Amino acid sequence: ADKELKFLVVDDQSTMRRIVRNLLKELGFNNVEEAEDGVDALNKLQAGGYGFVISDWKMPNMDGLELLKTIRADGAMSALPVLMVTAYAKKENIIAAAQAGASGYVVKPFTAATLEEKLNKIFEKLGM
Numbered sequence: 001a002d003k004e005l006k007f008l009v010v011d012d013q014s015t016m017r018r019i020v021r022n023l024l025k026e027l028g029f030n031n032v033e034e035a036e037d038g039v040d041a042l043n044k045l046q047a048g049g050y051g052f053v054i055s056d057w058k059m060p061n062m063d064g065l066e067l068l069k070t071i072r073a074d075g076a077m078s079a080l081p082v083l084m085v086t087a088y089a090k091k092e093n094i095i096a097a098a099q100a101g102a103s104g105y106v107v108k109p110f111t112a113a114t115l116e117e118k119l120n121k122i123f124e125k126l127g128m
């Protein structure tokens, strides 16, 4: 994928945002911004230019399933890649996120290799 691809990393825990941002840097992606919940995310997205969203689920103000649904329903951003990265591991959560249009889903805790693999799977699916 294009190394200038602009990522938005959304998680309500600063530790997890730092993990994901650092992993992206190792993969050669430095154009990375952060958000703390779905509302903060949407504000950043409105500003434009984003090419990929990595999102937590459990967050105050707007949770990540609502964020994913909002993105998918909005004409300006309906095709934005959204990778869910969450501690929710139950199949009903996986099903609800998949049905809502998630591009992929990673369960926390996750290894660097898992994040790379799942990002690549999405790049290949979308021809990026």
Ligand code: BEF
Pocket: 056, 057, 058, 059, 085, 086, 087, 088, 108
């Ligand atoms: F708080 Be997240 F869904 F891991």
Ligand SMILES: [Mn+2]
Pocket: 011, 012, 013, 056, 057, 058, 059
């Ligand atoms: Mn959370």
